[PDB]
């Protein structure tokens, strides 16, 4: 039988040059796309200022306008989805993770514009939803769109171009080429059967996109925290303890995130309007908190550097934690076009920071610095929920550039999935494709 | 499809007992790797309290710094040829094969053979890494517990074997990430789904990496400090350097393979014509390892100095060439030792030199040779062994210059993109190919 192996071995790493040359076009396109999307998202959150400041005199006139814009935007958001591509809703990844297994479709001629503009509306309005996930999906469709335009055929050219578009996307976003590749080959990639995905094609794409991004985003980071301190071996155990914690809570958060899209489903029954309305509802509720305590609203990026520094009192932290848990559920569970990827990053940071502080005093002889645990936890809720330790650890580092924390970072991210297994829990990004795949059928 | 829904809702559930073992493996692969590394040193040391001891007499040095590298290199090949002809070579293709149940894990032999065997070839100071050798010592450590506890069933067999492989490549370069990434990108059976438990691995990689730290804190392997950054207008220079390594990567693959053929005549297979030609190349090293150390030894220590730019363009090309030779002549001679680490040096040096050329060719880019040195340090692990991802992560893992990340990939990709377009193949595979197509027949 090994008579074959010898041919395969001596045949390894030979990808159809034409599949490569496309991963490059995809990458470049997923890139220009991701850039533009991000830009517009901002441009809107801006106007939502030259509207607030414009009437800063009148107080209730603010609260009002900072509700109607987040409503009029969040509404226009849900709408575009419910009436044109009920798949743009939710994260935007399970539909790709499914599509890799030919279990869901890549209706790019719809999902592209829908997920784009749709998101500008939900993100530009400032809801607790990341723009990462949504970009992963925009990516895939970008890939499949060229796949169809050039009729390249055959699993490899289909699975490959589709997967490079997914990573080209998750990369041009956090500007983390490594975290991108690592994500596909650890989560996206069909989990229980060999696949015809060309690893080398991906890289070409991840780069092409990451360059396009750079072309329009140099001299600035997403999260800047500078070289925090180091972590001595005698303090390594504390990262397991924190690891366990995220572990027991990761699945629980998975319950709420799923069971909240059920309970939120009654309130509209599926009615395009009871939904769209409940849309400007949660939408507007955000634009409001997004000016009466911004920590509970918006993406949540901007507040990470400040949590790591330790500028939040233990209280304000717990407050922000709880409040965010709510706003994130209430927002993701409401089937609005937007990821729950980014927000979990915030969620973790905060929980991390807090654990830090407790520690910092409990052991004055360890000379701790809350900030380390904030980093040791920033990817921990990406480990207990979505369960992709490796992609999670690499993403953090990718953008917090603190490799001296690498050990505590893993000992935490492991204790995470090691306790999210030992206690129910499942790949939050899977359990979704589960329900959305068991609903396709089981309904006829 | 109806099956999927069960598998999905069933993902990430690994037999607790498989995990608890990956931990014992790791820990063991750990204490192991530590001790191995220590001993290797201890010897290179003695080879000094022997040199200095007779530093007066010149030819008396050259002599002793040949006999120790002979008496040790011989004792090396021997232990292999007479007790486990697999310990020879890298030590990875045998594990890469073993993952596919195409080769065997004779740990009761390969363990002590590869250990002491290496101490002999490394402690003597030959152009051979101790990395690969540790990957193998790892696997066997895994399989050794697998057998001692009779855990059964593919997963517990493939899993514990793989964690021992990574736990090894990790406790060595102290790069837990590079380890995991290596398995799931190279070791792992390349053309068919496998029952390897990713989560088990980590537990192992860590356990080992800790053990290492317990005995190796406050010191790095390669220290180069924060080099400058790299502007977009200078990104193209890293493709050009990528292409270069790409065309030469396979050529180096020819010589490394075709040099174990040509070196095979000289002994025919004769345990002694080999053992003798052993203390031959072996001693030749201990010699250069005192008349121009740059051409001998592992090659680690000279990386920081190459990045700095303290080597004249000449001395570089010299060191390059001479190393190419000494590395082939050493790896191709089936002695127990990897060609992994030394390719690191090979790349550095080639990178540095490309650097310098650039540095002056474009004074308006304000380049710093050192960046290309790092953009290339993992480029020969990309054109030869063709493992970009593991390669990039490894460099970074230990050069800590994440601002170079873009130039690092654009080079490492231009590498495999030119090593494909021009013959070449997974040097770590093409070995299991010949050793698997030779087994049969």
């Amino acid at each position, epitope marked *: 039988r090994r008579r074959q192996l010898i041919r395969q071995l001596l045949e390894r790493d030979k990808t159809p040059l034409a599949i490569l040359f496309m991963a490059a076009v995809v990458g470049t396109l997923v890139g220009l796309a991701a850039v533009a999307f991000d830009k517009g998202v901002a441009w809107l959150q801006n106007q939502r200022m030259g509207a607030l400041v414009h009437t800063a005199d009148n107080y209730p006139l603010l609260l009002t306008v900072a509700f109607l814009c987040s409503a009029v935007l969040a509404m226009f958001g849900y709408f575009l989805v419910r009436k044109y591509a009920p798949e743009a809703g939710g994260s935007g990844i399970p539909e790709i993770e499914g599509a890799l297994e030919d279990q869901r479709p890549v209706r790019w001629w719809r999902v592209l514009p829908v997920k784009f503009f749709g998101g500008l509306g939900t993100l530009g309005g400032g809801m607790v939803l990341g723009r990462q996930g949504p970009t992963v999906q925009i990516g895939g469709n970008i890939g499949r769109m060229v796949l169809d335009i050039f009729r390249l055929k055959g699993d490899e050219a289909r699975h490959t171009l589709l997967a490079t578009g997914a990573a080209a996307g998750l990369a041009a976003a956090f500007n983390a080429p490594l975290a991108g590749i690592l994500f596909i080959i650890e989560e996206m990639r069909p989990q229980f059967r060999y696949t015809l995905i060309s690893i080398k094609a991906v890289f070409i794409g991840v780069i092409m996109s990451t360059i396009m991004y750079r072309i329009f985003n*140099h001299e600035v980071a997403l999260i800047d925290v500078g070289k925090l301190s180091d972590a001595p071996l005698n303090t390594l155990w504390l990262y397991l303890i924190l690891g366990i914690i995220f572990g027991i809570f990761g699945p629980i958060f998975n319950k709420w995130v799923l069971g909240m899209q059920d309970l939120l489903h009654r309130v509209h029954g599926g009615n395009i309007t009871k939904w769209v309305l409940m849309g400007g509802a949660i939408g507007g509720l955000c634009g409001l908190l997004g000016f009466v305590a911004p920590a509970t609203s918006g993406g949540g990026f901007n507040l990470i550097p400040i949590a790591t520094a330790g500028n939040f009192s233990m209280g304000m932290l717990v407050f922000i934690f709880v409040a965010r848990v709510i706003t994130t559920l209430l927002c993701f569970s409401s089937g609005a076009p937007g990821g729950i990827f980014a927000p979990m990053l915030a969620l973790g940071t905060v929980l991390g920071t807090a654990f830090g502080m407790v520690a910092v005093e409990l052991f004055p002889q360890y000379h701790l610095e809350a900030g380390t645990f904030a980093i040791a936890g920033m990817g921990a809720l990406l480990a207990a929920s979505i369960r992709a330790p490796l992609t999670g650890i690499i993403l953090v580092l990718e953008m917090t550039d603190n490799y001296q924390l690498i050990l505590p970072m893993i000992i935490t991210g492991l204790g995470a999935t090691l306790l999210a297994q030992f206690t129910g829990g499942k790949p939050l990004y899977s359990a979704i494709l589960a329900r959305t795949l068991a609903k396709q059928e089981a309904e006829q | 499809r109806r099956q999927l829904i069960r598998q999905l809702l069933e993902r990430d559930k690994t037999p607790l007992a498989i995990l608890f073992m990956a931990a014992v493996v790791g820990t063991l692969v750990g204490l192991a790797a530590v001790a191995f590394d220590k001993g290797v040193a201890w010897l290179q040391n003695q080879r000094m309290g022997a040199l200095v001891h007779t530093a007066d007499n010149y030819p008396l040095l050259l002599t002793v710094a040949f006999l120790c590298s002979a008496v040790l290199a011989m004792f090396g090949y021997f232990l292999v040829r007479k007790y486990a002809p697999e310990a020879g070579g890298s030590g990875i293709p045998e594990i890469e094969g073993a993952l596919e149940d195409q080769r065997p894990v004779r740990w009761w032999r390969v363990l002590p053979v590869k250990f002491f065997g290496g101490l002999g070839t490394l402690g003597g100071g030959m152009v051979l890494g101790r990395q690969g050798p540790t990957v193998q010592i790892g696997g066997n450590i895994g399989r050794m517990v697998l057998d001692i506890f009779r855990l059964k069933g593919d997963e517990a067999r493939h899993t514990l074997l793989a964690t021992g492989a990574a736990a090894g490549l990790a406790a060595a370069f102290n790069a837990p990430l590079a380890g995991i990434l290596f398995i799931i990108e190279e070791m792992r059976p390349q053309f068919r789904y496998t029952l390897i438990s990713i989560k088990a691995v980590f537990i192992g990689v860590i356990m080992s990496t800790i053990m290492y730290r317990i005995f190796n804190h406050e010191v790095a392997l390669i220290d180069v400090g924060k080099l400058s950054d790299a*502007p*977009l207008n*200078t990104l193209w220079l890293y493709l050009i350097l990528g292409i270069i390594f790409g065309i030469f990567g396979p050529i180096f693959n020819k010589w490394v393979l075709g040099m174990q053929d040509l070196l095979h005549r000289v002994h025919g297979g004769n345990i002694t014509k080999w053992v003798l030609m052993g203390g031959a190349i072996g001693g030749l090293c201990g010699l250069l390892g005192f008349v121009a150390p740059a051409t001998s030894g592992g090659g680690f220590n000279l990386i920081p100095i190459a990045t700095a730019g303290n080597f004249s363009m000449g001395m570089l090309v010299f060191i390059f060439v001479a190393r190419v030779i000494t590395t082939l002549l050493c790896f191709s001679s089936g002695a127990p030792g990897g060609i992994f680490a030394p390719m690191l040096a090979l790349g550095t040096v080639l990178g540095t030199a490309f650097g310098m050329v650039a540095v002056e060719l474009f004074p308006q*880019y*304000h380049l*710093e040779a050192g960046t290309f040195a790092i953009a290339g340090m993992g480029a020969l692990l990309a054109a030869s062994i063709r493992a970009p991802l593991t390669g990039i992560i490894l460099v970074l893992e230990m050069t800590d210059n994440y601002q170079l990340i873009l130039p690092m990939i654009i080079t490492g990709l231009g590498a495999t993109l030119l090593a494909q377009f021009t013959g070449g193949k997974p040097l770590y595979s093409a070995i299991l190919a010949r050793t698997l197509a030779k087994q049969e027949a």
Partner: antibody
Amino acid sequence: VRLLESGGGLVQPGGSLKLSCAASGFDYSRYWMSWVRQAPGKGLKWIGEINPVSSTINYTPSLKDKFIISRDNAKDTLYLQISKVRSEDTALYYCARLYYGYGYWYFDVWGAGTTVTVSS
Amino acid sequence: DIVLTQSPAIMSAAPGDKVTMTCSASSSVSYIHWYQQKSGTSPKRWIYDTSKLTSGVPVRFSGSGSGTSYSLTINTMEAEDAATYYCQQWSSHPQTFGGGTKLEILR
């Protein structure tokens, strides 16, 4: 971020003067420092540039050691030594901090100035 | 070394007016820069990489050009724009500056 250069003044033909430039408000390292002089009424002319570790130092097309740029990162100070000076050397001497956008370097933050007049 | 020559040596226009100054290179350049120099002050980085206003430059200003010929523009110049603008390149070593353009306000 203040770039304050001193040293200038009056020097007799064939003389030598060490212009100094003290930096503050940023990390001196990571930064390529340079000098540019403006002759009264005329435009600017780049003199030299010295990378961080001072492992690189270039000047414009001018002879041997008319100029000798150096820097003591221990004092965050940039230096400039002009020897055998002549009237063409009478101008305003600025020390800038160098950076870049896409990569085609620019003179980021120019300091104050210091004047050197060659005369008896 | 490149010979940058800014067109209008001196020019005057009344505020709220649209003013444009040229900067031609002897050979070929790319990603030009512009510095503003008001009387009594060292130069100030204005526009760069051909058209990136610096943090602070009024959106009144705009850069442009390509290879052989570049320009800098002010849509509705203000009186506070009176100064001397210096285009400089470093797309070819050694860097080189232009002859400068002096803007004068008509009131």
